[PDB]
Amino acid sequence: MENFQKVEKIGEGTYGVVYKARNKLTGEVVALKKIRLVPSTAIREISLLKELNHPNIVKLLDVIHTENKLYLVFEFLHQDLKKFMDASALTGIPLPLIKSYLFQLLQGLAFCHSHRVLHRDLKPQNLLINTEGAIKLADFGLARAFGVPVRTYTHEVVTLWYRAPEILLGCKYYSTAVDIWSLGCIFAEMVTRRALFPGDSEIDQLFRIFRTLGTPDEVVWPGVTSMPDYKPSFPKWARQDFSKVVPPLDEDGRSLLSQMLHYDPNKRISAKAALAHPFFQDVTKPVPHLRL
Numbered sequence: 559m560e561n562f563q564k565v566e567k568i569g570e571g572t573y574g575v576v577y578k579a580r581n582k583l584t585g586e587v588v589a590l591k592k593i594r595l596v597p598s599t600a601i602r603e604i605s606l607l608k609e610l611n612h613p614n615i616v617k618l619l620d621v622i623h624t625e626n627k628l629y630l631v632f633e634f635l636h637q638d639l640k641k642f643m644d645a646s647a648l649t650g651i652p653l654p655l656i657k658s659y660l661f662q663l664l665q666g667l668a669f670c671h672s673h674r675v676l677h678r679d680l681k682p683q684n685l686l687i688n689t690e691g692a693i694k695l696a697d698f699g700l701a702r703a704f705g706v707p708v709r710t711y712t713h714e715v716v717t718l719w720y721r722a723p724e725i726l727l728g729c730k731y732y733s734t735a736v737d738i739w740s741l742g743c744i745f746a747e748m749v750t751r752r753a754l755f756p757g758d759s760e761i762d763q764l765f766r767i768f769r770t771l772g773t774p775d776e777v778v779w780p781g782v783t784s785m786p787d788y789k790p791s792f793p794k795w796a797r798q799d800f801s802k803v804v805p806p807l808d809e810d811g812r813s814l815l816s817q818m819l820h821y822d823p824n825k826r827i828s829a830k831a832a833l834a835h836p837f838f839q840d841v842t843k844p845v846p847h848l849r850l
């Protein structure tokens with residue numbers, strides 16, 4: 559910790575405060591994350607993450623385990639997708655830039671998923687951008703290390719907006735499909751400039767999904783009626799057209815989004831298969847208009 563000068567609070571993450579900081583010796587600019595107090599399994603899990611290197615994954619530079627305290631040192635990025643989306647709202651992020659960001663996030667997911675590491679808590683706040691037109695996933699793997707809480711250390715409510723239905727229905731065993739669901743939610747949000755499912759409680763989240771995608775049943779999702787928090791008494795809404803859900807997304811994008819939002823996690827498209835979807839045929843890498 560004391561090898562680092564704090565520059566500014568960037569905010570409060572799921573686990574603790576996050577600071578922009580400078581390495582007092584080398585002068586590296588980093589994101590310094592203090593983790594709420596560790597358990598030996600967390601230590602070993604976190605150490606696995608240090609090897610999990612990819613250009614679309616925010617690089618974990620160091621784990622500092624001293625003073626019976628936990629600090630993670632990450633590559634610093636200057637802006638998140640929430641801020642960029644807010645700043646891009648009058649016109650929306652251009653479609654070629656949305657496609658580039660999606661394509662790159664799918665490459666980051668395909669990499670981590672191939673090593674059997676899930677994120678489990680994707681959201682615009684942990685998708686980070688640079689001036690070179692890259693986008694990167696932050697906090698990959700931390701959920702398995704530390705366990706997603708209802709509120710943060712400072713009592714902020716953790717979003718349910720990107721949570722997959724199998725989590726909301728109480729499944730204990732998450733697959734990589736939960737990441738594809740979240741990213742599909744984020745895809746829809748970039749295109750429409752509104753969150754797809756802005757739930758404010760678990761049942762509101764579920765019922766918003768149900769109203770857009772149809773109440774899931776045994777036809778679309780074998781095994782659904784036997785999940786822990788499924789209730790026979792759930793209302794039965796009908797599905798709406800994607801044409802109505804994500805205008806003005808084109809037929810390729812609407813097709814891909816449908817596959818990312820399949821109820822059954824076993825039918826949901828994988829990151830690798832999604833990279834091959836015709837939506838990405840004409841993918842490019844534009845430079846974003848970034849004000850820092």
Ligand SMILES: NS(=O)(=O)c1ccc(Nc2cc(NC3CCCCC3)nc3ncnn23)cc1
Pocket residue numbers: 568569570571572576589616632633634635636637638641642683684686696
């Ligand atoms: N709000 S902002 O666009 O100015 C912004 C967003 C992210 C960062 N950087 C950042 C932020 C971050 N965590 C965010 C979690 C949600 C609260 C804000 C900090 N983790 C990071 N890892 C590497 N960089 N980095 C800096 C500015």
